[model samples]
Target: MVIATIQAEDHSQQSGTQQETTTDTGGGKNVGYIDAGDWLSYAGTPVNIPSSGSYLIEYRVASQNGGGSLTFEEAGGAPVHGTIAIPATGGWQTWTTIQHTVNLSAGSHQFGIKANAGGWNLNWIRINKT
Candidate 1:
């Protein structure tokens, strides 16, 4: 299996995005102050999928009410890689890694996160061939 980690701060277009310190494991930084309709685009970080097969998509997030819904899409919403739920981990800094399996196409594509419902903080994302 192959795994790659992408930080939230590496986004090319930080629309409705802000940065904050994190106490989470890996202990770097996170994106905060995000509301509904806020999104993080990764144009600079191009992900290369080896094959169109089973892949694990993971997001390190923290939420208050666990009412967060997000989409992992091919940059612009179309061809959504997967949609995931962010559970409340007690506090905003209380982080948890959420994951879902998806069928990713075999190509070089820049993925972006669409925050369907906000009230959460994102630290990083991981993609692994599973």
Candidate 2:
């Protein structure tokens, strides 16, 4: 399922700047207005893992020029999941779901996404048991 925006905690930039924008896409409103050199972070959403195993980490994103990447990790934890490649889907409103598998412990934890490169927008992140 697509995670709701309300589940997202604080959305801030580690470097550079960004803004939130609403969209008609099925993933809901996404964070846009991104530029190169921008490192964004999303936190606070609680995820419940049924067990310690590999899960699919999906991010709804769009980029016009492509080449942007998002690294998923626990809020205060190390980089558990590697990076997800964000491909250009024509425009900012053009959305796509990029996914990767990562092993997570069985419990509740806050998920985070860091934009290593910019020129992309994020709608939401979903984690499903694999």
Candidate 3:
């Protein structure tokens, strides 16, 4: 199984994004200070889906006060792919890997983790054949 991890700090383009260090997971920087309309986009490093089938999309995240949510979409919202609830993990640095199964097409494509609501921290995202 091939597992690809996309670090939040490596986004090619971002709006209203603030990144800082984390001790919760891998000790790398996580993207924070996100607003409701903020977005982290990947254009320079497009995600290449291995196949057109079932796959797991995982997000390593933390929320202090909850109410965090996001839409994993294409080119903003043209293809609103998946929406995942960012569960509160007690503290900003505390972490959890939330997973969602999506049927993705095989190819190289740009993606955006667009914020539906704010108040969460994201360390990274991973995609794997499941």
Most lDDT-accurate candidate: 1
- Candidate 2: tens digits of C-alpha lDDT, residues 34-90: 555444454544657677878787777778889887677876447556677788889
Model 2: how far residue 21 lies from native, Å: 3.1
Could you estimate the TM-score for every candidate? Answer: 0.94, 0.77, 0.93
**Candidate 3 residue pairs in backbone clash:** none
Q: Rank the candidates by lDDT, best first.
A: 1, 3, 2
How large an RMSD does model 1 have? 1.1
Per-residue lDDT of candidate 1, residues 18-63 (tens digit):
9989999878899997777999989688989988888998888898
Angstrom error at residue 125, model 3: 0.2
Q: Which residue ranges in model 1 land beyond 4 Å of their true spot?
A: none
Model 2 residue 76 lDDT score: 49
Question: Which structure among the candidates has the greatest TM-score?
Answer: 1
- Measured by TM-score, how close is model 1 to the native structure? 0.94
What is the clash count of model 1?
A: 0
State the local distance difference test value for candidate 3: 0.86
